[PDB]
Amino acid sequence: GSPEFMALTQSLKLSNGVMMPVLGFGMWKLQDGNEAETATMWAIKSGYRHIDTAAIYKNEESAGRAIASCGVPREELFVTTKLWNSDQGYESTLSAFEKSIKKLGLEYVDLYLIHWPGKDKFIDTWKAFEKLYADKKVRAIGVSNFHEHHIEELLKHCKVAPMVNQIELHPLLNQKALCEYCKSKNIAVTAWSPLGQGHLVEDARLKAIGGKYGKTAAQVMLRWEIQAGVITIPKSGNEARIKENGNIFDFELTAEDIQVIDGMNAGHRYGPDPEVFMNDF
Numbered sequence: 001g002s003p004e005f006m007a008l009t010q011s012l013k014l015s016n017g018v019m020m021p022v023l024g025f026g027m028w029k030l031q032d033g034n035e036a037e038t039a040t041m042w043a044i045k046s047g048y049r050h051i052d053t054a055a056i057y058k059n060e061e062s063a064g065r066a067i068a069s070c071g072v073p074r075e076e077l078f079v080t081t082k083l084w085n086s087d088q089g090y091e092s093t094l095s096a097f098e099k100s101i102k103k104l105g106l107e108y109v110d111l112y113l114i115h116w117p118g119k120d121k122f123i124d125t126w127k128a129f130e131k132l133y134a135d136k137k138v139r140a141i142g143v144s145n146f147h148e149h150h151i152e153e154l155l156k157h158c159k160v161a162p163m164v165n166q167i168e169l170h171p172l173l174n175q176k177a178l179c180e181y182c183k184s185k186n187i188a189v190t191a192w193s194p195l196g197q198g199h200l201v202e203d204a205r206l207k208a209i210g211g212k213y214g215k216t217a218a219q220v221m222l223r224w225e226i227q228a229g230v231i232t233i234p235k236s237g238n239e240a241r242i243k244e245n246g247n248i249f250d251f252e253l254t255a256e257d258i259q260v261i262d263g264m265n266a267g268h269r270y271g272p273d274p275e276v277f278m279n280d281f
């Protein structure tokens with residue numbers, strides 16, 4: 001059968017030529033140990049080749065075991081981790097990265113992101129990212145929760161421009177403007193809480209649309225995101241839902257459905273606002 005021929009490899013090309021799978025597995029709060037480890041294994045076995053974690057999630061080690069246990073070579077897997085706010089700063093970042101890489105038990109990370117912008121320590125933190133990139137400890141470097149002015153500020157103080165901006169994005173917060181800005185700068189967008197953190201999986205508007213294709217609201221959201229040119233990383237600790245989220249390279253939303261979903265925007269965040277969130281800074 002070959003796990004190879006079945007893998008969910010549809011990807012987009014980042015500005016530096018690296019291919020990043022448009023569908024990834026979110027790991028926020030999977031409980032370190034058996035839970036996170038088993039869920040991650042179900043994902044990898046289902047065809048996922050992109051995994052999203054973060055130091056702050058306290059489950060990098062579980063992710064590592066899954067990766068070391070699945071039957072797929074490291075080269076075919078895209079692994080992302082993030083630098084938590086408390087570790088910003090040049091030397092602090094290099095040290096944080098080592099801790100993360102050692103828990104993941106890997107020789108290199110595919111993508112490393114600054115978790116939150118904060119106030120005035122990301123530019124310095126970035127030099128460390130560019131250092132890790134130059135040395136090849138990470139194959140791509142990016143940002144997370146950055147508004148357009150945060151990026152403009154970084155672009156004035158960097159040698160290498162970020163390649164990804166991971167932001168909260170779903171039907172109630174489509175982020176069309178920030179997505180456009182990022183595209184202008186050749187920055188790929190990854191959507192977090194792409195299913196509205198589970199609060200949109202039963203939306204009548206989304207379900208109705210899904211009914212036209214024998215697809216669920218969750219699958220409709222993920223497809224809407226992918227067609228919008230964004231990368232999506234839904235999470236789940238349920239084996240059947242993991243497989244469900246991966247069955248989105250089957251159909252296509254019509255121009256009408258897309259306009260209907262884009263029409264749902266309410267500027268609603270389920271998460272914190274990058275402008276004010278200062279935890280651990």
Ligand SMILES: NC(=O)c1ccc[n+]([C@@H]2O[C@H](COP(=O)([O-])OP(=O)(O)OC[C@H]3O[C@@H](n4cnc5c(N)ncnc54)[C@H](OP(=O)(O)O)[C@@H]3O)[C@@H](O)[C@H]2O)c1
Nearest residue numbers: 026027028192193194195196197198201218234235236237
């Ligand atoms: N950089 C950042 O600031 C940031 C912030 C938040 C999240 N993230 C990342 O992005 C990921 C996604 O964010 P998130 O986990 O908050 O939100 P999400 O992925 O939208 O969460 C979806 C919720 O819906 C349920 N679900 C998943 N698939 C489903 C399906 N097919 N049908 C019905 N319910 C389904 C899940 O429950 P079950 O587990 O029971 O399936 C889960 O609780 C995270 O895991 C994390 O890696 C990054």
